């Protein structure tokens, strides 16, 4: 009776939420090596205090993967409940 296609919207969003943790934590495809980068510095002049620190946690990172988000979510919004619901619920149906 009540809608099916509009209900998937709550499912796909529930599923994509784990995908954000998957892409950030795994950040791989086939456990490849890659190559990485390094850093440098400078001498400066004078004297004074020099330090820094940072912290924080929140919902999604809108300034890190927001453009990739629209792409990964595009895969789920066209999927069925049994496809999405099964991911979030972790049940094969």
From TrEMBL:
Q: Which chain positions lie within coiled-coil regions?
A: 62-89
Q: Which family does it belong to?
A: Belongs to the ATP-dependent AMP-binding enzyme family.
> What is the protein's given name?
Peptide synthetase XpsB
Organism, as annotated: Xenorhabdus bovienii (strain SS-2004)
Q: What is the lineage of its organism?
A: Bacteria, Pseudomonadati, Pseudomonadota, Gammaproteobacteria, Enterobacterales
């Amino acid at each position: 009776m009540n809608i099916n296609e509009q209900t998937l919207d709550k499912l796909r969003q529930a599923v994509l939420q784990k995908k954000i943790k998957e892409r950030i934590q795994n950040s791989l495809s086939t456990e490849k090596y890659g190559s990485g980068s390094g850093s440098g510095s400078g001498s400066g002049s004078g004297s004074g205090s020099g330090s820094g620190s940072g912290s924080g946690s929140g919902y999604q990172i809108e300034t890190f993967f927001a453009q990739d988000i629209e792409s990964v979510q595009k895969e789920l919004e066209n999927l069925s409940e049994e496809e999405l619901l099964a991911m979030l619920n972790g049940d094969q149906q």
